[PDB]
Symmetry: D3
Subunit: 296 residues, 6 copies
């Protein structure tokens, strides 16, 4: 077909945010939970809703054009196919601002953990054998792999393994099974990827247009509009504290020769630490306003 | 009573946004789902929560002062009462910015649709007989009406009708019953209406005050505060692309470009953002507005 | 088509129990909430899932064969069509054992001739009208299709005539139930025009199943010990579907064992009355299916 | 350890019924959704709550004693391991009375299907490549496999395949994606299985005891206690209509009829009830049985 | 008033079963979550739905007639009022068949527990200070009380106490907070209680009637109707396995065996069914009983 | 050591208590079953407890900070005082949530003219101490009936003649045929601290958090305003709009009679103020939200 094909997760932790991103990029569509393919009404785009496990392979095989997938799953599949002698490839278009999670080694609460060497020779249960293997090789630790495709935290209490390597964000399931997180081995986030084989000129131009929108949407979520007063003597430090998307606008203050007004757009979000550092450097009247849309 | 009476939908697609609008207009009230009448604590206003079907009639009969109702239901009921020889009347105060939907003719997926004439002589099932009738009369198409008050999309597969005229927004229920949308006949949105008979001077003044607030609230939702850089050579085009509530503020930059600050009349879609970039605009920032009054 | 068409409520208070009844009558089907027609896999039957409001009309117009509908909605619509000069008709096959509710006049907590001249708000104008005409009371009708209990506090009416089962919504709006005017339950109805012989025979078969399913829910299998001297009184306390089976008890000459199937369910009052008459070892077992 | 280990699905279509069966077999335990091992309080049994996909492998590897799994998943995994040169083995203890589903070939609604040969050379998408392969080999049909681990019904509309081989029970998801079921290739239900390597004498005796309970629970669900009146003349015919677990008890009632008490081997359907009446039976009572043991 | 007043829990672990019991005793009423007092339509009875904490006090003060409350809350409050010099009193009418739980001492998983003496001098956190105190006194153990009205399992990790005394049924919350149950100090269930001061003759007669119904309802839940075949030679052993006198019936054309019909006093567990089979019993049927009265 | 903050586990204050801490830059992972959350970026432990216990934990010095409703705080303070104890604490900040009131209510049918109508009545409440203090202050004798919940049942069930109950909406009162008649106490959530001095390091952390709390609350209330004002009306317009700082006044290019005013309001802008500004000749009034602010 002439229409651009984008694979996203049908249901799971990435689904809502994947749809939201596309929608905020002006891709109008009607999604019914039972329908596995949504057709955009205003753009030549088909959204395929599939299991996240299959997204890397669909992209590697060139059967969809774009995909939104967690880095962890993308790499685990890439490594697996490489280990079977294949040469999977893809283009990473953008690391996205959701799907944050980590892959961590965990042990029974009772165990005494001092360092990574404590895993030497242990049986380790995981749904991510390749990612675990690569990390253990890099650190020169021998172990016995036990692959489980789910319910990984059962393994120690059930004597299937001595430890686990599992995905975590909150920590809940670990506590419930008498386990403690001990070492983060991998950090992941959602990515937007593209198949390796060149698209048609028209499809590629549509991807280019979307990508500009994606960057815009993400940048608007992170960036803030900042207004503050700064002493002229401290301007360079203040700017170093708050990196901007462009050069700051500097305006004279009418009744005041020692200070200036600074208007700028931050590259990153403003945390209280930064607000406090700015005040320490002599900044005052600091205002941070939200931005709904932007385009550099 | 001396208190102003406003009828809104108890529960349904208009309920949340009807309450939100009143709340954003400074009408403080405590609503609980089981209570059918909420009394405003800061203004002399009673909110009656009723079935949307009855709102037009309550207004026509002059028994409430204001109502928020979908256009589709308002006119269907107006037309129905006219067909019984009555003379319903009301004042349309404002078309609102929610309750968007459409009434559409639909056919079985298998049917070949070329033009409206393909509906000649067909049996058409609908919950909106009057709206359908008026549209078919305007376009000179004869048909057989089949009134169903719900589950309209069953009619073709159940051989109650050859086609349907139904409310749609998403399209889901049509696919599930092997139907395709083929012609939009009516587009609807929520409206704020008032009874025909004059109110007391005090009540009318309260309505006037609320109306100004309604316009403000709606404008603040649509309008955005825009900041961008524009080449001086392209300002006229840039301003045409983005109509404003007032004239833009133009500020010199620390050369051949200027800074433009303005308030858009409408919301900024990506197409506009892209058209501005094409015309040479850069550093385009769009900030939300919480309240406004010209 | 050759297939029998049954209209039931898509979603609402009658839906679950309508499907259950058909299912317990051996009508196998797969219902998906979004699908508005279910086809029976084991019988030539189509289930049309519609709004309850339309079921009477579909039956009156002969466009479906059977329907399950609340009596209240059935007669309200019958009366409405009669008032427009039409002559709706149907066959009442069976009053069912669910959908119980009542239509009641209610007044503000603070307050039949007392309704004389009052404004009365209702979603059932025809049923109210018929009742008020029968009792010779003049009133002013106010039709509301929902939220009826708002009317008094909102000064739309002086009283209401509304559907109730629990009473909750009345208390919440400072109203009290004052007079029941109509009692309703779900009914199974059929169109007036004769069916084909094959369709009618299928309906006849279903009807016997419906009766069986309902009787099994009400009837219980009863075993007890009774003194021979009190046997007549005990049998009078417990009407049965058949004559009781009477069995001698080993080594007890004054008493007998009684096994029977009750026509109605056994309430504690009956259990206590049986004990008063000298019955002992009373056992009540549930029945899953029956056919007399 | 001395305790018997049983693997069941953590969450999914088999979970509720797996727990119910064990509970009805007198295995007391407290399951918290977050806890992946439940310890029986009254028997030496550990319930491991896992992903269904892993249950066959845990059994093949002898690392749990019992498992409750769908036949489809069991044989798909058995076949997969055989294709890698392994020799997986297990004992099938009992086919259970839930988890009913089927694996079926399906095509777009528009396609003309006459025979299995119409699948010749087609791309077929499935989560059950091995089961599909075995069936296609048995019937001598060449095809191209496309493995998808979920959302299989997307494949045709997305041009990933020409057809699918997917699990169905209702049919809903097929309609929603413009597909029609065309050929059932495999029928499945939940099974209770055991590892191949011999258990201790104590563990095996516990399994034996549980198995008799499983059979009892399943028979009690199917069997009913029946009481009816039959004419003495029609007696032979009535018994033939109603196969029992034992011979019927016949009791005198007046002189022309008898009372019949019996336990049915199978459940009583309305057809049987109606056949009995036709043969002259009356006062037919069917009572539920909560527990039984032959 | 002339009407009998019964206090039950509005919402919580006892609420559903309290209502069910009354309903199964033929008390017809319409109970809506928003309504705090339900009036029985068929009997002169008012159901007050309150917080369980207050039920003992309402009974002690003679302000309601009956109450359904957990033993633990009843005695905790009794003890508390006694410690303030009051003399609370009540009549225990019946221990009921729901609301089962236990009050248990628990420690961090890491702690070595050998005996009760290990609690000597510890800080113990509990919502049931009086029940804990009575138990620690009866055993001569000194400790430091820490009263928390909820979230008791936080205390050790938060260094508010060294141990806890908390309500448990399913040990979930203990595991989640790295705690282990180590000594049950008190076992509880729901009870039906009555105020001490004599009721009117009419009210007391109504209570008497309800009590017989309560006993009947509970017995019907436990008792089962049993039918089996037994060898005449094993009849005594079989009857000893199954605690009124059984009905013994001859089997037609079988002289070595008899049919036994019994109503069990207790429920039949698999152990008993297996023991019956071991003694030569066969065709064992257990049917449910809906109502009974001796 | 680590700073200990007690908040409500689940209830009306729980969400907003967590949100406030989160908006103050306290990062933490809270799982509903977990009763103690450890901040990942600051030395802070969040204890999730029953609100009833928070005052006592603070009084006893066993946690450092607490977020609790005023009503529960003073009810417990009063209760402990009545047992001869001397509970004490520091009130750090009245917060912008947990708004409710304690009110006397009567059956709808009763005729209420004055507080004296409560003389000698039986009054049911979960807040005996707060009621007692109010009734003593106003010299009214009554009979207390303590109920720990379902207070609105008491009149219809003849447990009392009246109630003193927490309300925000009036829903539950209507449902039980009661009317609110006199507000006796107004409450909101408070952030409190134990009386005994903290270590210098812990106190400095509290000081830092407090400035953040004030910032977060100010950003919720304050708005960024832009408008046009006639030069002749500037003084009146500024009086209508108290600001956090002095307004910035800018000339308008094509217009000599008017100026542009940019400012940050101290309070939120209600329609009344917008309308008053317009009445005074202001035009093009824009109100933008503020996400964070520091003076
Ligand atoms: N707490 C979390 N927050 C954000 N993202 C997460 C979190 N946990 C996991 N993820 C990411 O989301 C991805 C999908 O998670 P999810 O649990 O929905 O996948 P799944 O269980 O494999 O679902 P399916 O296979 O049915 O698509 C993970 O691979 C990971 O990249
Ligand atoms: N998808 C939609 N989005 C927004 N508004 C809609 C949509 N569909 C319909 N509406 C509007 O909302 C009105 C009410 O629809 P809704 O389904 O809430 O009430 P209803 O079906 O009439 O139910 P009831 O009569 O019981 O309140 C419609 O008449 C129409 O004006
Ligand atoms: N407590 C009750 N209140 C109202 N109706 C009841 C009640 N109990 C049973 N019914 C029966 O159920 C029928 C349908 O009630 P329900 O509220 O489901 O339908 P509805 O309000 O007409 O909605 P719809 O128009 O969507 O089918 C009533 O006409 C009545 O016969
Ligand atoms: N309609 C159905 N669709 C799919 N499986 C069904 C159906 N009915 C019964 N089953 C059975 O249930 C088993 C488990 O299905 P389920 O969808 O719960 O697991 P899953 O999708 O593999 O999820 P998980 O991997 O989390 O255990 C299937 O292998 C099958 O044997
Ligand atoms: N696992 C359990 N945990 C606590 N109480 C239980 C448990 N099982 C049964 N109960 C009984 O339920 C009673 C209280 O139940 P529940 O926890 O619902 O009320 P509550 O928490 O005291 O709430 P309220 O005080 O608001 O009524 C206990 O006093 C006890 O008798
Ligand atoms: N409408 C309201 N009703 C009652 N309390 C409110 C209300 N609004 C705010 N609150 C505040 O929230 C506090 C706790 O409310 P909530 O009812 O959640 O706790 P609770 O019922 O005492 O539960 P727990 O004791 O189990 O924490 C009150 O003490 C009060 O300060
Ligand atoms: Mg996955
Ligand atoms: Mg409507
Ligand atoms: Mg209806
Ligand atoms: Mg699976
Ligand atoms: Mg309690
Ligand atoms: Mg509390």
């Amino acid at each position: 077909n002439t229409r651009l094909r984008i694979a996203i997760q049908k249901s799971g932790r990435l689904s809502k945010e994947s749809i939201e991103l596309l929608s905020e990029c002006g891709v109008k569509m009607h999604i019914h939970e039972q329908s596995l393919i949504a057709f955009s009404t205003n753009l030549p785009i088909d959204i395929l809703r599939v299991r996240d496990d299959d997204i890397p392979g669909l992209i590697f095989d060139g059967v969809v054009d774009l995909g939104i997938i967690g880095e962890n799953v993308l790499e685990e599949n890439e490594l697996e196919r490489q280990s079977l002698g294949e040469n999977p490839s893809y283009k990473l278009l953008k690391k996205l601002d959701f799907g944050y999670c980590r892959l961590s080694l965990a042990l029974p609460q009772e165990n005494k953990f001092q360092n990574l060497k404590d895993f030497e020779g242990l049986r380790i249960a995981t749904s991510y054998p390749q990612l675990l293997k690569r990390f253990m090789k890099e650190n020169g630790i021998n172990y016995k792999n036990c692959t489980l495709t789910g319910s990984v935290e059962v393994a120690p209490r059930a004597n299937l393994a001595d430890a686990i390597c599992d995905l975590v964000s909150s920590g809940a399931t670990l506590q419930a099974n008498n386990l403690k997180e001990v070492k983060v081995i991998y950090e992941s986030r959602a990515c937007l990827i593209q198949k390796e084989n060149a698209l048609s000129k028209e499809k590629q131009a549509l991807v280019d247009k979307i990508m500009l929108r994606v960057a815009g949407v993400m940048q608007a979520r992170e960036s803030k509009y900042i207004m503050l007063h700064a002493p002229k003597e401290k301007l360079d430090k203040i700017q170093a504290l708050l990196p901007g998307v462009e050069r700051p606008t500097i305006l004279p203050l009418a009744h005041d020769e020692k200070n200036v007004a600074l208007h700028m757009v931050s590259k990153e979000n403003l945390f209280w630490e930064t607000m406090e550092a700015l005040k320490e450097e002599g900044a005052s009247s600091i205002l941070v306003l939200p931005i709904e849309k932007m385009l550099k």
